[model samples]
Each structure stands twice: as C-alpha cells, then as structure tokens.
Target: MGASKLRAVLEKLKLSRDDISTAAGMVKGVVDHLLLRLKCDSAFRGVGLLNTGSYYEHVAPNEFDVMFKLEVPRIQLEEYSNTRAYYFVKFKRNPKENPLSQFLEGEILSASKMLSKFRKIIKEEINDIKDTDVIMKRKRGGSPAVTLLISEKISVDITLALESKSSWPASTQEGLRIQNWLSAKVRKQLRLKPFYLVPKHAKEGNGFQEETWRLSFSHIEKEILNNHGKSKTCCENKEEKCCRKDCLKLMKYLLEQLKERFKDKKHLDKFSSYHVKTAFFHVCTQNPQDSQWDRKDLGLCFDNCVTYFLQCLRTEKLENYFIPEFNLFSSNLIDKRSKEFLTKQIEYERNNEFPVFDE
Candidate 1:
C-alpha cells in the first residue's frame, strides 16, 4: 500500500467540491424554511439553528447534521450521576407562565412531549415544501433525528436540542484535556460557551426517566477541528498543508468500507466514526508537531493514527474526548469478540492499501 495508491483511492472515495456545494445548498433550503416558520411561531421563541457534524468539518459532506435549539429563560438542570443520558430539567419561573408550560410534567419538562411538538412542526414544514425530489423520513423507535433525504447521495439529520448556560457535567471537566495541547485561553473560551442537551428516549418499563436528555458537545468539537493545529500558521498555506483532516477522512472511509464488507458481522456495528475521531484527537495531542503530519507524510501519519486506534481497541479503553469518565469502549458497548474482529479487519486494510475501497 504505497502513498500514491492510497491517495488515488481516497480521491475516488471523496465527494467532489461541486457535489458537496450542491448538497450544502439543498440542506440550507430545508434549514432556512424551518427557521423562517419556527421564528414566526410564538411557541418557538428564542429557538435557533446551526449546522454541525462531519459534513461541516469537511470530512464527510454526503451526510449533514442540523441542530435546532430551543432557548428557555432561567432553565435549570438536575444531573443523574448514575445514568449516561438522563437529566431532570426545570424552570426557575412560574410553570404556568412559561412558554413550555404545555410540555411540563409538574416541575420538570417532558423531553418526549417537546420533541413530539417539534416533530409535528417539522413534518408540516416538510410537507409544505414544493420540491418533489425531497423525501422525509421519520425513524422508528428511539432515534433522535428527523431525517430529510434531499437526494440519493445526500441526507440530513435534523436534531432538536435544548440550550443551557449551566455548568457542564462534573465527569466532563477532567475529560477534556485539551489544555495540555492547546492554550489556556482557548480552553477558557471553550468552557464559556453554552453546552446543549439533546432529546433521547429511555426504554419503557426501565427504572429510568423515559424522556432523557443527553449532553452534547458537538459545537465544541467543530471548533476544535476548525482550529486543530499546534501553531496558528499550520494548514494556512497551501504548500505546507498538513494531512490531519485528510488522515481522519481516510480513517473514516476505511471504517465505512469495512462495515460494508462485513455487513453481516453484527459485532462491527459497535465501532463508529466517533471512535476513529477520538483516535485522531489523541494522535494529534501526542504528536503536536505540524511536521509530523506534513502533506508528504500522509501515509505515515495515517498508519500511526490507525495504530493508536488498534491499541485502544485491544485494551478496550478508548475514553470519550469530552467525558473521560465515560469509556467509549465499555464492555457493555463493545465486547471482546468485536474488538478482535475490528483488529483483524483494520490490519487487513492497512496491509492492503484498503482494497475494500479499490473500486
């Protein structure tokens, strides 16, 4: 697997610049329409929209993530340390006068109820769109996203979130170790930004809150990627381009191709792009030199990144970049057999220049 061959394969896997632009325009239309309608509605006051995810990072443009936040006044969050994604939300003001009063269950806000209302609003807006080429999909079960398929190649996931100015979870404080890699000023700026909680349903009959909200740091993740460099001048010049983002894209593509090849292997389902992303971040922190990821060293850097990922899988100790207490490779999330399978698969790709993407 030479660098030249690897580069050729990656070029084939990437969506062209024009294709990415077209997809972005289509998603913008959907987002703009939703924003216009929601802003005018009294029920959705203070709500705002933002585009995030891999597409915004320029890693995978075929998929888009549009986040809609409903900003409430004087909202409070009650953390459940025992759980991963369940939080009790309340308002500081009178419940009767609150804009979300209808969705209130006593003092707490019902995430399911609020999400239901949002779904209805989006469904109506999607129905009003005259574009016959667009298709709307409502995923069954506990999925949080409302999907809009703009074309065969492009799809957008619209997730409704709640904005909070309150403190982040205690578990996340020690987890985000970017201070050692980036500056204290950057760390302070990131911490000052508001964090989001997204709507997700817990299983019925479980001893957990049914309408749970998960902490989301996607906005921060985008900022980190955008400013990912040891020095300010890194990646600013075309001649001195680094392969950090390029390596990440290749890693993600490799994982996707492996999943496609081993579709029937249910164990592979546990491995996701987030795991690859975490590995990339860890690799960057360890080797902070821009020269380590020089354009000509794409293959070497990519191989090193995969080596780190493989080590994490073998040890089953890949920590979430934002929440160190949360082990992404927890035994319950991914078993030993799955880790072994992934190890072999990744080795195969590395040794063969990723033949799964040869086409």
Candidate 2:
C-alpha cells in the first residue's frame, strides 16, 4: 500500500511493504513454534489440530489465508498460523482521524479489559468439569500437584503494542501500560487463580516497563507448556541467553527444510515479506530489531509486526514451509498513542518493587 493511502486511512502512521511483511512474519513464526512444541512434547494431551481456514477467511475480505484454530485441550485461539493467516483490523487514529483517541486513558484499564476476554475463554476451558475431573482422577493428587491433566501454560503475557520508534515516550510507555491493563483484565475475566507475575519482554534494553503479570495455563494444557518458552537465566549475561538462540536454531532448521524441499515455490511469498525476514531474524537476535536498525525499523509502524513474525517462524521454519503471493498492509491494531503509554509505565515501574510475574 502507498504511504499516502496508509496515512489517509491511518493518520500519523506510515509503513513500507517490507516493514509490514516483517511484522506479519513474527506473528506467523510464534504460532509455528507453538505448534511444533505441542507436537514434540507429549505432555500436552488431547491436543488436536483443526484447519479453520473456511471460518477465518469468512471474517474479512481476503481469502482466509492462514490457520485459525483453537489450541485444545486448551481453549486458546490460534488466530494465525505461519502458513495461512492474514487480515487487518482497522482502529482509527485519534484526533485528526477520529476524536476517540483522546478519551483513551489508563493502560491498566485497557489491559484489564483485553485480559478479561482472554481469561474468560481460558477459565471456561479450565473449569470444564467433564475434562478436569477425568484428568484429576488419573493423577490423583500427585506431588507438584498433577491433579488435572491441564496443558502446560506459557507464563508469558503476549502484548499487542503499537509500534513507535520515534518518540520513545509515546510508544514504549503506552505499550507497557496497555500490557498491564490487558493482563489484569484477562485475569479478572478468566477467573484464573493468582500466580506470581512473570514478565516477558521482547528485548533486553526495552526493559520491563509494562506491568506484566503471569497467567498460568497449567489448568488448561495440563502443564505441558509451563515455562517452556523461557530461558533459565536472564539474558543480562551473555551466558544466560537461551530464548533467542534456540528460537533461531529452530527457525534455521525450518527455513532450510523449506528451501531444499519447497524450493521457494510454495506460494507463501505473496502473503508476506515481513514473514520471511522474521523467520530469519529470530535465528540471530533475541530482539527482532536489535543492533539491526533496519530490522528494528520494520516494527515501528505496524501493530502486529511481531505477531506476523511469529507466523513466519512456524510456517517457513517449522512445518509445511512454503511461500505465498504478495498480500501486504501497513496498518496494525495498535496506534501510536498506545505505544507512548507503555514507554512511560515501563520507566515508572523500573524502580518500583513489584513482584515479578510471567508475561
């Protein structure tokens, strides 16, 4: 899409095709990784993969390009898979674009709301007495408490923050606040039992600005994925780094297979360029936009750039790797103002003595 069209539709936000593609790849990659993890680890039982293309494509104008299935035995929705997911949800930019922007306030409030919806579904699945009781009886009060065969939940709070590179205050602070609000909302909505907050950050320097609280999926996945995505130690020390490196290795392995077998003919190239970059980027950097200014630049304007990146990781790197035709967009669900709020909250909470939680 042209910068002018983007600006007209999303004022104050402009993005290149490459940038949009990169973000999309991130989303794709993460989903792919999750799928692989599930398949490889038997701890997650009652898991079934469903092809929800017909339903997903029905939601928007574009053909349902990616997989949108619920990750069950757990009730989590897999919105986009690496191989086949694409859609753009438009939220008007405030003031010039729409007056509603000004009224938006309190990141905690926003996050709380977002979390509520997410948690409600999670809770429903968890309290599903039919399944819970069966599993609970199987283990029968084992130590470390294997009462129910719930899937291991990823303790990280996934944030859908607005990308804003310039004016760190706007993007960073707002994102954090939004995260806090989103997490709280999810917890309240899901009626999830409280667990210590485990903060998950995209990059190291970005710092933990948002109040990230952990929501355990133990009750859902039977603990198969509990803390599976994390590093034993913080990346603060070079030796401590694990998350990025392993993800990259997985990405590389997936990509190589795609290249050798598919020969770049898998029609996926059309769907995203961002997807490709993200799969590759994850291999080397813990942060998608780390020392690499160009990579970092890709995420600035797009909302789900990271989400798209995850998509790429899964499709290109992990399974059924292929390429699609060009279908790109510069807009993301997150706006500039939301990012600003996250930045501020991160800074304020930097010195605050809050117990750490999973993101």
Candidate 3:
C-alpha cells in the first residue's frame, strides 16, 4: 500500500507516526488501526512480541547468561493476551553509533502519517454509508446481514540462538544458502526486492553461538512464487510432463522397494543415499532445566521452524502470530486496552526522552 493509505489508518487510530520509536513500531501501529477500523478485533489473542540480543560467555569474564534477552512482559501472556488487540514492536541498537536509526525513524514517521489519513477516509466513508441504505439492498428484497473478518498486521521479532548446539556452524551456512536460493526464487516472481531483517550473530568458543533473522510477508511472497515458478517452468516442458506427473508415484514406489530391501536385515545397507540427504528439523523445549537439550538446540530448531513455517504460510496465503491471550478481547475491550497501552507508552517516552548526539 502507498504512504497516503497508511496515513489514513494512523488518523483512524488517533495516532501519529511521531509517537513511535522505530519503523517497525510505526508499521505495527498502522496495522492495529486497520484491524480496528475493519472491526476484526478477535484475532489478536495468544500472540507475542520478542526483542533479543546475545553476549559471549567467556569474553566478558563472568559466568553469566548471554547478555541478550527476549523483552516481552514476564506476565505478558496473562495481562497482554487478555486484551482484544496487542502489538509487538522491534528495533535494534548498535553499540557503535549506528546511522540506520534515521532510516528506521523515517519509516516510522511515514507509516504513522499514512495510517492517520486512512482513519479519516474510513470515517468519512462510514458516515456516508450510514446516511444511505440504497447500497445495502439485496437482490431478494430482504435485509442482508454483513460480517467482517479483519486481521491486523502485527509485528514479531524472531530471536536466533545459535550457540546452544555444536552443529550450527555447518547448519548456519546451509541456512544462508537456502535463504539465498529462496530469495532468488522470490525476486524472479514479484520483480521486486522484499524487505527482511537478518539478525546479528554472537561469537562463541568454537564459532558463533547465536544468530537470528526475521521472516516477514516479503519472505513468504518469495517462497511461494519461487515454488510456483519452478512448477510453471517444468509444466511447460513436454518431456518433463510425464516425469513430473509421476514424480510422487515414483517416490512412493522407491520407498516401498527400500523398505523391502531393509526388512530382513535393517543393517544390511548400513547407510543409504536417503539417509545422506539433508532434511529440515527443529528442537525446542518449554523447560530450560532439561540438560539433554541446551539453548543452542532451541535456537537451531527455532530457525528451522521459522523457515519451514514461512514457506507454509506463503504457499497457503495465511498469516499467523504468537501474541498474549489478553490481546484477544472484544472490540470494547480492545479500545480500552489501546487507550491504556498508549497512555503508558507515551508517559514512558515523556519521562525518559534522551537527546541524540552527533558523531
């Protein structure tokens, strides 16, 4: 959508982009306004916001946990999830004075301005509709019941934990390659570069312990179009038609043969090409005390899942989120929550405003 449309949404939410801290926050604020204007407040529950950073174990000379952490509320699930709508905002601060802050600030301002304009347009349109019933007529000469299902574009920050496992040194390289392959596929489809966030890595004894990246709408678009592009090109080749049509059938038959071959002496093959092939997998535990699995294990698994799920979402044109349960309240509840959250955030900004210095 264009900046003008975004401005309308901001107006509707009674907010300005100036109120946000980062580009991500501004985008999320506009999205929240859109959802409320569309009257679809039921979908925000069970969602979450994450902010992360990491520190080395040995470099600092202290036996401390990584310096980076996930920065949502400790009781976010209980308090935030109960609201009808909640949004997560993300930003990164560099220890070295970073110039990118201005870029982010610009994005935030633009988004907020667009949303404000959107809100005004919607209100005017609604007023016009309320004054006229002619557009509401049904062909059968009966009153029609209208239902609206609106989903907001909420922000989520993905945390990468590479240090929890030893195999990530290799796995991360593979992950980057896969991401590049996917990027090529997507660029070929939409003819535009999709925006994304690639997280920074933390140094470890062997290599890097943690790395993270975000998969947004742009990532999904690339994955889906890339797959379709392959399918489309393959479908055009005459000789590949028969081969393509029977690919699944042939795979099933091959699996059956392999099973039969190994049935008697499962160790006969020892290792086969199938086992040599790489497939995606993830590992994460709700409990941190479990020694069998470490944080690295969780980090690797999180990355795999993000890649896998983004592909799935793109193929299906579905958007999903992890938010607090309070975020799933009714319209009245959401309106109230928005007011409360806004007040607190604004107050915090007022009290803690810091001056930026020139380098």
**Candidate 3 residue lDDT tens string, 38-139:** 433121221222221111111111111111111111111111122212211223334543322232332221222222232334344434333221111111
| C-alpha lDDT of all candidate models, in order | 0.77, 0.27, 0.25
Provide the lDDT at 19 for model 3.
Answer: 36
Query: Model 1: how far is 28 from its true place, Å?
Result: 1.4
Tell me each candidate's TM-score.
0.89, 0.19, 0.21
Clashes of each: 0, 95, 43
Query: Mind giving the per-residue lDDT tens digits that candidate 2 earns over 25-126?
Result: 443444344345434423222223332222111111111122212221111111112212211112323234322122223312122332333334333443
lDDT of 3 at 49: 26
All candidates: CA RMSD (Å): 2.7, 23.8, 26.3
Per-residue lDDT tens digits for candidate 1, residues 66-100, read 89987866577776655554577888878356777
Clashing pairs in 1: none
TM-score of 2: 0.19
List the candidates ranked by TM-score, beginning with the highest: 1, 3, 2
Q: What is the lDDT of residue 46 in candidate 3?
A: 18
The candidate, 2 or 3, that scores higher on lDDT is 2
